[PDB]
Amino acid sequence: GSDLGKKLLEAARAGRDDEVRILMANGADVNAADVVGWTPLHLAAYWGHLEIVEVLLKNGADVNAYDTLGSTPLHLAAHFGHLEIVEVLLKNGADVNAKDDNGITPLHLAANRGHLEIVEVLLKYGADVNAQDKFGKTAFDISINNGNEDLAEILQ
Amino acid sequence: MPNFFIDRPIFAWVIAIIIMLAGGLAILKLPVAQYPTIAPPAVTISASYPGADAKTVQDTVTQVIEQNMNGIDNLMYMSSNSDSTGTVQITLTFESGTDADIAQVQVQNKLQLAMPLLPQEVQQQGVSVEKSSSSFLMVVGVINTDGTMTQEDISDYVAANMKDAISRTSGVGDVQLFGSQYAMRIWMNPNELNKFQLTPVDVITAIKAQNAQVAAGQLGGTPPVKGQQLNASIIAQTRLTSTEEFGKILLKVNQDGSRVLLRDVAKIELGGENYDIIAEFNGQPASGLGIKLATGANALDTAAAIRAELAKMEPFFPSGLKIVYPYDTTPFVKISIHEVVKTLVEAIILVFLVMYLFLQNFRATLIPTIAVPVVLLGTFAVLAAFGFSINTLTMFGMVLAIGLLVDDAIVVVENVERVMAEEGLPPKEATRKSMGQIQGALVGIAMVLSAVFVPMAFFGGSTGAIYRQFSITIVSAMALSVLVALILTPALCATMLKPIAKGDHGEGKKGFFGWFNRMFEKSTHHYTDSVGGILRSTGRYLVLYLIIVVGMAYLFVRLPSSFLPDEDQGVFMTMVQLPAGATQERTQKVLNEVTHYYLTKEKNNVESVFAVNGFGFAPRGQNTGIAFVSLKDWADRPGEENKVEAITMRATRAFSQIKDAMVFAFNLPAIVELGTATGFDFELIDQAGLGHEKLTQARNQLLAEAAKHPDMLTSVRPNGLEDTPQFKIDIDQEKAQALGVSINDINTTLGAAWGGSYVNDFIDRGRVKKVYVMSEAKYRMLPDDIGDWYVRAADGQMVPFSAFSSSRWEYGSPRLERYNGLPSMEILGQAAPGKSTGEAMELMEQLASKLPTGVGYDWTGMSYQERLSGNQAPSLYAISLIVVFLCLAALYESWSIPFSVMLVVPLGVIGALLAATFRGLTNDVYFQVGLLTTIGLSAKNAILIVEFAKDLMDKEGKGLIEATLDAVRMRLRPILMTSLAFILGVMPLVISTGAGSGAQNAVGTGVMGGMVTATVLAIFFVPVFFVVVRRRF
Amino acid sequence: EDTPQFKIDIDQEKAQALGVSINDINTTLGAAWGGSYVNDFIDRGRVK
Amino acid sequence: LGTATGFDFELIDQAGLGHEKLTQARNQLLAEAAKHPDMLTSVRPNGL
Ligand SMILES: CCCCCCCCCCCCO[C@@H]1O[C@H](CO)[C@@H](O[C@H]2O[C@H](CO)[C@@H](O)[C@H](O)[C@H]2O)[C@H](O)[C@H]1O
Ligand SMILES: CCCCCCCCCCCCO[C@@H]1O[C@H](CO)[C@@H](O[C@H]2O[C@H](CO)[C@@H](O)[C@H](O)[C@H]2O)[C@H](O)[C@H]1O
Ligand SMILES: CN(C)c1ccc(O)c2c1C[C@H]1C[C@H]3[C@H](N(C)C)C(O)=C(C(N)=O)C(=O)[C@@]3(O)C(O)=C1C2=O
Ligand SMILES: CCCCCCCCCC(=O)OC[C@H](CO)OC(=O)CCCCCCCCC
Ligand SMILES: CCCCCCCCCCCCCCCCCC
Ligand SMILES: CCCCCCCCCCCCCCC
Ligand SMILES: CCCCCCCCCCCCCCC
Ligand SMILES: CCCCCCCCCC[N+](C)(C)[O-]
């Protein structure tokens, strides 16, 4: 990578909007990835930094960038209950049916943590409700196992 | 009492002899160390959970132990760390004065009953309870120069052949091995295990069965059949002793009849218990021993005994093995004693020369030469009675008291010589009268100096214990100085001195002394004429006094505050911190570059570099390291350019160019536990189960606010580590049950392979040592290797890990901190230039009060000390001033006259402040104790002036000015003699640039500057004070 | 003076071939020749 | 120190008699102390 690529990964994670702003002006690599394959957008999505997610996507960040285990920023945002970021990523063309190495989708992760608003947004953008993981489990199979009767009704 | 001993000089001699014998005995038997025990008693609980993450360690070990640390006496606070190396360290800090043995056994007893609650793996490893100590006597490095041994090989040799013998050496307390004894390492192969349908579970099962001590019984044991002839013990299975035996451990017998041994599925060798640390000495593999001095032991005798034992181990060393001494404090302590003994001897010689310059008879010069050693020796007997040691603080405590000791000797003798010269009285009658003038004052002085120094002993915490060393040393020496002045010195004067004819001031002599006596008698008239002029216009000198008092107050506020000055001790540390996730190999490359620098660009200064990969200041891990630098002899490093400070600044500047690493050198502190003056130690606490992430957010919020106040706060950072990406793997319970695969077999296979498992013990050459099973490195490096590990199902099918597992990347803590049983995050920082520690702390409290709900805080360590130390000061200053006043009031029989003495304080303080400010030194303890001794001697000079003046007015019925002029005339010579001797006595300390010069400069500079002004101003100002006070009241 | 010791050597491979567990061998030899402290009982109100 | 003129008495099983016999022995002593009101008052067991 590069020196500024490291500072952007740190700034994006930390939630330092002003530092990200200056780094985007100076031309810090938006596609800079750490050893596990996490871009600044991965980190911003994980820690729930909405403005940085939007600024990175404006500066040509790969919305469908995946780590060394095949997980995308939408996977992270959907799993940790960041509703606004999930909407932004999906508007900027995030693959709603993105499968990691385990066959897990953003819908599976949202269903597992009982993020009802996010599950509805994924279904609104055409989330495959019948999509199975490596163990042949759907988002509905997770809801009945978790005992989330509200979520199970949405997924029908 | 002086009258009693004037008529009884043999009795006076008997007392002096008894004092010298007691002191002579004390010198031989007194303990010797660099510094005494300063820090409050602390007990550390250490446990190891092999292959455990920070949260696993915290939630199974740390929290369980913390919840059970109840019903223990005199606990101040409890703090702990749980990191990803599988290590937990809980530190329990106790009240100053607590019995450290009782503290340890109480902690240890509460742990014992909490052991059944801990994981069986942690119970197997053990949980060490030790008394926390940072101060090493010396570090013995053990290296191999011919490259025939690894660090593991050397560590095993030291543990087996050296460590125990060093632990038994005279004066040796504790010995720490920098490494471990051998462990039987079974490096498993997953391809070979799967091939024979075996797992790590089978390897552990087989080792436990085939490496064990089995109890059998006895032939013809009781109760026997009567007529039995033989009774013998039955020996069955005993532990395995070699790699060969472990390789022949039977795992499986195949259908055809072929045997699967442990050597078929694993690589077997004697290796290290763990591989986290890589130690190198100038690039070569190294182990070592960290040796601590035993309680009440002699550092110099112990270091000599350690080297004597290592010397007779030399012949039995393997080829290439060499002993090196990267750290040893005794050469520094050797110099400290020599330089202090030198100062005391030179001081006695300087007094002899001054005594002869003025009095000009060899009989007079003998009385101080006898008296001062008698006081010094007596002081040692009193230190021994108090249970003190010969250490840096107590040694410099006696150097600072030289001025007071010397004055007692001069004042008594000089006053007899004058009385004989002025009246023509014979020595004995002259001595009786001379003592009659001063004996009441000398006692008054003893009480005034007691009032000054004794309260300094009653400060709490670390700094209080340091001040207590100087306090008892000075008070003891001062107390014995006055007893010797009231008993021995008068008896010596009366019996040894030669009579002087009335009016003989030596003006009729020829040569140097004829000239000098005429010069000084003329100078005394110039002085009294000058005081006469001053006392006609006191108003303008009262104004000049307020300029001095204001100038003093101004310089006090401006002078930067410190604890103890940093010394060139022939060593300094270099920190190496790489970013998160950085491997052991990457850290070694930075360390190799750091070492290569010191041996190339500082080859004339540096002797060796001790590079330790896997250990930082506070943290551990693969991305942390430290390079302990050892310098050549002080003599080979001339000038400031080749000193630790110059080298430090040179190295730190050179290493700022290094990429993907934070590297810098720095000098060791005098005492590590003090920290930094202006430095604070802050704890941010989770008070309502908010969790790790929310306390992190609250920390970031506080750190950001602290950054907006650079005028008040500087370098406000976390002491801990940041969250790192960690490999979360979920076992599918349904899939495991569906395939007939047990979860115990899964978690054992994963844990044993990737983390390592301590199975049981074996006996290597008559020494019990551990057996570890772990994956051969190459099969436990990357996530793809997870699938290569197979677990046997109930039906006999080998199932890969991928079939029943799913993984993802997440962030978690590699080091979780707790404070008083609650989740915490330690924040270090310091007050900005010009700002006090107190102001910086008050802002941090103000910033802390604006943090989210359920986020509290607390002050720990030096900050906890600083608060409880600062709350006492006002009371201890008040008591000192009040008792000084009351003592002077009893002496002079006056509520007003005492003010004329107490007004002298600033005259000595301004000179100390000017000298310290000019030379660019700090307000350290040596300077502060220097002020009290400077204030003490000037106060004594004023007391004798005011006593002589008051007595002249009372007895001879003289006027205020007449008495004042006649007093200061009589007191001029003795004041100049003491000042001339003492200022020359501390001149070597000021100009010193050698080893231990930092402390010598701090003691010398402030005292010399203070004495110059105290002497010059007081002789002119004490006359003014007395007249002004007497006129007013 | 040094005492004579009766060293018995259990062939675990032969024991495994005959389908005999090592724990049963160790206990049988141990309990018989050495005596095995199993558990406690109450003799006239006292634990023994 | 205790109440003005209270006493704290212990009845001991010295010969492995058992709980039942010690209860009977206690009941016997309580019944004996019951018909000495002139000397003893409120002699009772401190147990269940
Ligand atoms: C009333 C009569 C009494 C009898 C004594 C008379 C005293 C004066 C004369 C003494 C004879 C010797 O004379 C003496 O010589 C020595 C050596 O050069 C001088 O030496 C001394 O004074 C000079 C200055 O003059 C200093 O720089 C020098 O440090 C000091 O040693 C004396 O100043 C002088 O007084
Ligand atoms: C800041 C550093 C400097 C501070 C040092 C202060 C103390 C050391 C300096 C000593 C000076 C004393 O020197 C002395 O001064 C006084 C001034 O009142 C002079 O006194 C003069 O003025 C007074 C008052 O009008 C007259 O009564 C007197 O007849 C006249 O001689 C003395 O002739 C002189 O000998
Ligand atoms: C930090 N310290 C003083 C040093 C310096 C140089 C070294 O070369 C070493 C240490 C620490 C010691 C601690 C010991 C410890 N023990 C006394 C066996 C120990 O249990 C561990 C451990 N991580 O559990 C080690 O790393 C250790 O084996 C080790 O490898 C060390 C080591 O090699
Ligand atoms: C003659 C009267 C002297 C009064 C001064 C006595 C001071 C003693 C205070 C004490 O007990 O603590 C010593 C303390 C330990 O931290 O050491 C010190 O801080 C040195 C004190 C130097 C300044 C004294 C005040 C003069 C300013 C006008
Ligand atoms: C004869 C001289 C020796 C006298 C010294 C004794 C002084 C003892 C110090 C007592 C400490 C008092 C602390 C009070 C702190 C309360 C805070 C409000
Ligand atoms: C610690 C300082 C205490 C000072 C106490 C005040 C003393 C006042 C002096 C009065 C003198 C009375 C003169 C005779 C009338
Ligand atoms: C802290 C309590 C003691 C303070 C010191 C007392 C000083 C007493 C001074 C009395 C002056 C009396 C003047 C008489 C006119
Ligand atoms: C108790 C405070 C210390 C005061 C000491 C003063 C002693 C004065 C004795 C005078 N004398 C009786 C000898 O003449």
Ligand SMILES: CCCCCCCCCC
């Ligand atoms: C070798 C131990 C005896 C000598 C120690 C030095 C004592 C001097 C203190 C001033």
Ligand SMILES: CCCCCCCCCC
């Ligand atoms: C006006 C200056 C006079 C100086 C007199 C001081 C003499 C002191 C010599 C010891």
Ligand SMILES: CCCCCC
């Ligand atoms: C007046 C007798 C004093 C001597 C006692 C040490």
Ligand SMILES: CCCCCC
């Ligand atoms: C230092 C311990 C012994 C002291 C003798 C009174």
Ligand SMILES: [Cl-]
């Ligand atoms: Cl948590």
